[PDB]
Amino acid sequence: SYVLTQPPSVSVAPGQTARITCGGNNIGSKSVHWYQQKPGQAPVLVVYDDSDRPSGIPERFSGSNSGNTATLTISRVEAGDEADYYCQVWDSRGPTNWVFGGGTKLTVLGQPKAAPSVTLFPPSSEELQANKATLVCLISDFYPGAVTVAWKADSSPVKAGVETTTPSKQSNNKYAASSYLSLTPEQWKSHKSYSCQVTHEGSTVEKTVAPT
């Protein structure tokens, strides 16, 4: 079928111009469309018929098409522009009429660092009343998107009963993760406190909760 060729990845610093190409075999004689898919979101049309801007799409996005290359040009790139970008054409000949490019990941280099905000919740009285206990450690607003979580019962490390997510991007371009510690109500009651300790870029934020 008709083959669309996109770079797997394009990297740029904030404020720079990013260019994402789509090749090519006399693509200039076809009509090219572009879609943006941000992490965890539905795709959005950002260009149609080579250069047409859909309502609501930022002025910084610009489509062009010529010869064997269509280009999506993003001027003054922001952290929020990080996404997968797909080109698409409709081929009358077939057999595959609807062709998508493989997609390009746009990465924005050198975004500001942000230490994590950490909130720790003790088990609810309801959960205790059902003979269970879960500690909930919520970690948000951090960058870059790598942390490690350690739990402590009093001052002793605890590794059993721990489940932690991998970080994912938030709407504000920073990252979030959560960690859960499963305990028996007896264990919860028997220590003076439990702590969630979050390490990010070599520095640590620790929150503690205690029974009642």
């Binding site: 076809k30 009509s31 469309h33 879609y35 898919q37 965890g40 539905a42 795709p43 959005v44 049309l45 149609y48 018929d49 859909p54 997968d84 797909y86 698409q88 054409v89 409709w90 009358s92 077939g94 057999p95 595959t96 009429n97 609807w98 998508f100 493989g102 997609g103 905000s117 909130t119 720790l120 919740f121 609810s124 309801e126 959960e127 059902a130 879960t134 909930v136 919520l138 948000s140 489940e163 932690t164 997510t165 994912s168 938030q170 979030a176 993760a177 959560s178 960690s179 859960y180 929150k207 909760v209």
Partner: protein, 232 residues
């Protein structure tokens, strides 16, 4: 504001038929084309097919033999059936409004034009998991605000949504009326094979005493609906 909304089963067993519907609101099916698209985990977008409001169809050759798309103008809906599913069909499925364009580059009597299509309005997606595993509805617990979850003028409170399968659950607050400050964290997949997640809302601390906060949890694959009051 034309809106599209997928509805699906969430969980389908291997070999059975996947059935989805897209409900259009704020606009009509009439005069437009209507596509289904899917995206398996860690893969690109795969266009499945479209249907014109009149019923004419077109399909991607790779799924053609197993798929049927239909349209119901009387209910402003259109639908998809996919026979004989396997885990390769586990994916997020989208519906999207699809436009027909024509470029007339020369003389119309010389038929010097061509046709194209593109998708302008997208649904939010519905996650379909093909699994022999059984659905499980969650338990829901309040995460009370306290002097340990305040940050000066704001405070965090939430709901813990525990031990469900498969994804997803949706959490709203005050029946959708409260949106600002709402952060629903991605789910953890536990060693038990079950998911858990937390949803947190950040509110003014000065007024925690007099305000009412309720989290509404919906897990469609198990038909579980829970409202949980969250207070100090």
């Amino acid at each position: 504001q034309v809106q599209l909304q997928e509805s699906g089963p969430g969980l389908v067993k291997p070999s059975e038929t996947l059935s989805l519907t897209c409900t259009v609101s704020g606009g009509s099916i009439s005069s437009y084309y209507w596509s289904w698209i899917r995206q398996p985990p860690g893969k690109g977008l795969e266009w499945i097919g479209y249907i014109y409001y009149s019923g004419s169809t077109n399909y991607n050759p790779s799924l053609k033999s197993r798929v049927t798309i239909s349209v119901d103008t009387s209910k402003n809906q259109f639908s998809l059936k996919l026979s004989s599913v396997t885990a390769a069909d586990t994916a997020v499925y989208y519906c999207a409004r699809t436009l027909h364009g024509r470029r007339i580059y020369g003389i119309v009597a010389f038929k010097e034009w061509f046709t194209y299509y593109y998708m302008d309005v997208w649904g939010k997606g519905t996650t379909v998991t093909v699994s022999s595993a059984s659905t499980k509805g969650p338990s829901v617990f309040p995460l009370a605000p306290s002097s340990k979850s305040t940050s000066g003028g704001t405070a965090a409170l939430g709901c813990l949504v525990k031990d469900y399968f498969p994804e997803p659950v949706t959490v709203s607050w005050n029946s959708g009326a409260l949106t600002s400050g709402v952060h629903t964290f991605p789910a953890v997949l536990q060693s038990s094979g079950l998911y858990s997640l937390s949803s947190v809302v950040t509110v003014p601390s000065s007024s925690l005493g007099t305000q009412t906060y309720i989290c509404n949890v919906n897990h469609k694959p198990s038909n579980t609906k829970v409202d949980k009051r969250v207070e100090p």
